[PDB]
Paper text:
[name] (Alr) is a pyridoxal-5′-phosphate (PLP)-dependent enzyme that catalyzes the reversible racemization of l- and d-alanine. Since d-alanine is an essential component of the bacterial cell-wall peptidoglycan, and there are no known Alr homologs in humans, this enzyme is being tested as an antibiotic target. The structures are prototypical Alr homodimers with two active sites in which the cofactor PLP and cycloserine are localized.
The third structure is that of the K271T mutant enzyme in complex with PLP (CdAlrK271T). To prevent this cleavage, the lysine at position 271 was mutated to a threonine: K271T. The topology of CdAlrK271T was chosen to describe the overall enzyme topology since it is the most complete structure. The secondary structure of each monomer is approximately 25% strands, 26% α-helices, 5% 310-helices and 44% loop and turns. Lys271 lies on a loop in the substrate entryway of the active site and it has previously been shown that mutations in this region affect the activity of EcAlr.
Residue numbers in the entry:
A (entry chain B), B (entry chain A): 3 to 385
C-alpha cells in the first residue's frame, strides 16, 4: 500500500464522530455548512466532501472557484458556496458548475447577471455583510439596503442567502460578536421590511456554534471543529467533544552513531555531546514541517524526541536519547498524537493550529483510515 | 486565460538566463545536474525539467520517488536521481521508472538487487558518503569502503555514482567544506585503489559551484541558483548573475474606506487611526503567505504597502496610504519584484529564501511566461 516516506493520515471515523457531536448541539432545522476550504484544512477536500455527502450536510463552503470545481469534477453534488471573492473571469465557470457566489457589490451582481443571462442560467449568490471584521461585504447601511434591493431584482440572479463573519468569537468576550450581530440584524430587519425573501441566513462559525446558541439562524458554518480542533482555548470546550483527524507521519530513513563533537545539518548549529544516536527522517520544510520552528519534536515508539540541527528541505535529524528498539522504516509521528499536536507546533511558531494543518504540502499523500483500515490513498503528484 | 485569483508566475526566460551563466562557469566536460526537488523549489518541476531537457542538462535530482515518477509520467526521459531515502515499498517503482537511487548501506543495496533480479532489470545507484553533515551516507572509513566494494559486485546494481553534500559551503569560511572534501577524497582514492570504477563523482552545490571551482568532479548539482537566488549572502555573488524566476501575484478584490478607530480582521489586532483606504486581497496563509510574518508587505502599482491585521487563511488586508489609481481587480505582487523579495520575507520570518519558495500552496496555479507571453497554465487542482 503506502509507497511514500511521508504522509498524512486521516481518520474518517473521527470526522464522523466530530460532526455527529456537532449535530447534537443543533435543532433539527438548523442547516450545517461544512467548510472545506483549503483542501479541507489540509485533510483533502474531495474525500471529506464525500463523507459529508454521506452524512447529509446541507452546504459546503470553499474559498476559491477551483476548489469547488474540484469537488464537482469528482462528482460532488452538494451545494457549494465560495466564501470569498470571485474574479470576473471565473463567473461563467461558477455558474456552469453551480458554485454559489459571494457578492458585496451591486456592480458585481450586475456583471454576474449579465453572464448568467447570456447562458440562460440563473446564478445563485450569497450577500456578505461587513459586521466589523472589515474584510469583505456590504457596509451595514441604507445604501447597501437599497443596493441589495436592486440586486435582488436582477433576473438571472437568485439571492439565496446573506451572511456575515465574526472577528472575535473564539475569545472570552462576546461583546464584539453581539455587536456584530446587531448590524446583521439591522440588515435583516430592513430587507424583510422591504419584502426581500432571503432563504438562508447565517452568521456562525465554529466558535459561535459552540458558544452562541442564539445565533443559529438558518445555517451554521463549521470548520475547524470538524477536524477535531478547537478555535481557541477560550471556547467552551465541554460543549463539544473532539477527536483530531490527522496525523502527520514518516519513517525512519537512517539511523547511526555519531561521535562526540560532530555537527549536524546545515550551519552545524548542533553538536553531539558524547556519543549520540541519530536518526534521519525524510520529512522537511518543503513538506510543511517548517524550518521556523525552534523546538521541533517527534514521537517515535511513544517517546518524544528532539529534532536536532537545522531542518532541511526534505529531511530532519532526531536524537535518540531514550532507549528503544528502532530501525530504519519505523514510523515517526510529527503531530497528531500524544504530546505532539498541531497546537504544540503552533504555539512554538506563534501561529494557530489552523495554519499548521494547512501547511501540509502537495507531496504528502493523504491516506484515509476507516474502522482502523486503510481505505484510500491519494497522491497529489501521481496519476 | 487566468481564472484564479492568485497565482505564481514563472519566467522561463529567466531560468534560461540563469542556466546559461551557470554553464558559463564550467568546463566542456563537467556535467550539470539540475536539482528540482520539491516541485522545482516550487516553480513546477515538470515544466522546469522540460526546459532543462531542452537545454540539454545531464541529470535531474529529486527528493522523493514520486517526484521522479511524476516527471516520468510527464514524458521526461533524462536520468533522475533521488538524492534521498527510498523505502522498500518504493524500490520496484524506482527500478521500473528509471529512478537512480541513493544508497548508503550495503543492506539496502542487497534488497534493491534482489528486487532488481526479479524484474530482470539492472538497478542504478549512487552511493552517498557522509562527510560531515551527518545526514545520510556512509561513514568515511575503511569498513565502508569494503562494503561499497561488495555492493558494486551485485549483479543488477549498476553503481553509477558517488557523492556527498556540504554543510557550510555557503559560508565565508570554507574550512569545513574542504574538510568534507577530503573525507570524500579518501573514499574515492580507496575505491580507485580497489578498482571500483564509479562513472560520476559529484559533491558541489550551488554554493560550491560558485565559490569552489576546484570541486567540480564529474558533476555539480545546481539548485537554488537555477531559480535565480543565492544560497547565502556570503557567496561570491559577482561570479554569477541571476534573475529570480518566480513572482507571487494576486489581485485586488475589495476596496473601501474605513472609518477611524475600527478594527480589522482576527482579534482586531489592528485599529484604524483616521480614514484609511483598505484593500482586501485574496491570498492568505493557506497559499503559503504565512501568518507568521511580523511585517508583511505588498507592492502595488510600484509602491510598497503594509499588510494590516492578522493574515487569514485565504485573505489579507492592505493599507493604501500613498495615492494611486487602483481598482478592484488590479494586480498585487507578494514577492518576486522590486522591493518585495523572498529574501525579505525570509529575513522577517527568520528563515531562508529556500523555504519561502517552497511554501507556495497547491492551489496557487503556476503560470508560465516566455517572451513576455503566457504560454502555459497549470492547475494542481483541476482537470
Amino acid at each position: 500500500k503506502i509507497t511514500v516516506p511521508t504522509w498524512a493520515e486521516i481518520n474518517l471515523d473521527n470526522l464522523r464522530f466530530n460532526l455527529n457531536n456537532i449535530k447534537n448541539l443543533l435543532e433539527e432545522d438548523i442547516k450545517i455548512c461544512g467548510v472545506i476550504k483549503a483542501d479541507a484544512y489540509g485533510h483533502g477536500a474531495v474525500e471529506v466532501a464525500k463523507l459529508l455527502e454521506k452524512e447529509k450536510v446541507d452546504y459546503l463552503a470553499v474559498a476559491r472557484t477551483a476548489e469547488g470545481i474540484e469537488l464537482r469534477q469528482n462528482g460532488i453534488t452538494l451545494p457549494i458556496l465560495n466564501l470569498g471573492y470571485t474574479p470576473d473571469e471565473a463567473f461563467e465557470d461558477s455558474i456552469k458548475n453551480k458554485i454559489t457566489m459571494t457578492v458585496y457589490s451591486l456592480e458585481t451582481a450586475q456583471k454576474i447577471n449579465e453572464i448568467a443571462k447570456s447562458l440562460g442560467e440563473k446564478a445563485c449568490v450569497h450577500v456578505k455583510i461587513d459586521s466589523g471584521m472589515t474584510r469583505i461585504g456590504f457596509q451595514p447601511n441604507e445604501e447597501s439596503v437599497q443596493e441589495i434591493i436592486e440586486l435582488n431584482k436582477l433576473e438571472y440572479i437568485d439571492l439565496e442567502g446573506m451572511f456575515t463573519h465574526f472577528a472575535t468569537a473564539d475569545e472570552v468576550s462576546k461583546e464584539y460578536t453581539y455587536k456584530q450581530a446587531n448590524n446583521y440584524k439591522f440588515m435583516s430587519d430592513k430587507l424583510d421590511e422591504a419584502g426581500v425573501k432571503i432563504a438562508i441566513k447565517h452568521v456562525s462559525n465554529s466558535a459561535a456554534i459552540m458558544d452562541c446558541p442564539d445565533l443559529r439562524l438558518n445555517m451554521v458554518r463549521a470548520g475547524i471543529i470538524l477536524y477535531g480542533h478547537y478555535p481557541s482555548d477560550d471556547v467552551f470546550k465541554d460543549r463539544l467533544e473532539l477527536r483530531p483527524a490527522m496525523k502527520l507521519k514518516s519513517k525512519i530513513g537512517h539511523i547511526k552513531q555519531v561521535e562526540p563533537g560532530v555537527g549536524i545539518s546545515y550551519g552545524l548549529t548542533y553538536t553531539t555531546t558524547g556519543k549520540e544516536t541519530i536518526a534521519t527522517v525524510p520529512i522537511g520544510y518543503a513538506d510543511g514541517f517548517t524550518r521556523i520552528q525552534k523546538n521541533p519534536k517527534v514521537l517515535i515508539k511513544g517517546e518524544v524526541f528532539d529534532v536536532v540541527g537545522r531542518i532541511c528541505m526534505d529531511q530532519i535529524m532526531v536524537r535518540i536519547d531514550k532507549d528503544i528498539d528502532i530501525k530504519v522504516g519505523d514510523e515517526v509521528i510529527l503531530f497528531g498524537e500524544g504530546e505532539v499536536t498541531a497546537e504544540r507546533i503552533a504555539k512554538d511558531l506563534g501561529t494557530i493550529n489552523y495554519e499548521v494543518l494547512c501547511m501540509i504540502s502537495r507531496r504528502v499523500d493523504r491516506v484515509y483510515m476507516e474502522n482502523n483500515e486503510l481505505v484510500q490513498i491519494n497522491s497529489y503528484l501521481l496519476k
